[PDB]
From Swiss-Prot, chains A, B:
Protein name: Zinc finger CCHC domain-containing protein 8
Assembly with partners or alone: Component of a nuclear TRAMP-like complex, an ATP-dependent exosome regulatory complex consisting of a helicase (MTREX), an oligadenylate polymerase (TENT4B or TENT4A), and a substrate specific RNA-binding factor (ZCCHC7 or ZCCHC8). Several TRAMP-like complexes exist with specific compositions and are associated with nuclear, or nucleolar RNA exosomes. Identified in the spliceosome C complex. Component of the nuclear exosome targeting (NEXT) complex composed of MTREX, ZCCHC8, and RBM7 that directs a subset of non-coding short-lived RNAs for exosomal degradation.
Name of the gene this protein is made from: ZCCHC8
Residues of the full protein shown: 46 to 66 of 707
Subcellular location: Nucleus, Nucleoplasm; Nucleus
Domain notes: The C-terminal part (659-707) contributes to MTREX RNA helicase activity, in part, by enhancing its RNA-dependent ATPase activity.
Disease: Pulmonary fibrosis, and/or bone marrow failure syndrome, telomere-related, 5: A disease associated with shortened telomeres. Pulmonary fibrosis is the most common manifestation. Other manifestations include aplastic anemia due to bone marrow failure, hepatic fibrosis, and increased cancer risk, particularly myelodysplastic syndrome and acute myeloid leukemia. Phenotype, age at onset, and severity are determined by telomere length. PFBMFT5 inheritance is autosomal dominant.
Induction: Slight accumulation in cells entering S phase of the cell cycle.
Its biological purpose: Scaffolding subunit of the trimeric nuclear exosome targeting (NEXT) complex that is involved in the surveillance and turnover of aberrant transcripts and non-coding RNAs. NEXT functions as an RNA exosome cofactor that directs a subset of non-coding short-lived RNAs for exosomal degradation. May be involved in pre-mRNA splicing. It is required for 3'-end maturation of telomerase RNA component (TERC), TERC 3'-end targeting to the nuclear RNA exosome, and for telomerase function.
Ranges annotated as spanning the membrane: none
Organism, as annotated: Homo sapiens (Human)
Family: Belongs to the ZCCHC8 family.
Length: 21, 21
């Protein structure tokens, strides 16, 4: 389940950054 | 992992919307 979990983690980080911008 | 995959799709849609905006 490493792949899906890391994909979701990266998506959450990118969403955070995009919302800040 | 079906819930994981649909959450991944939700995050993909969210990031797409954020990039467009």
């Amino acid at each position: 389940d490493a792949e899906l979990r890391e994909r979701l983690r990266q998506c959450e980080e990118t969403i955070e950054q995009l919302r800040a911008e």
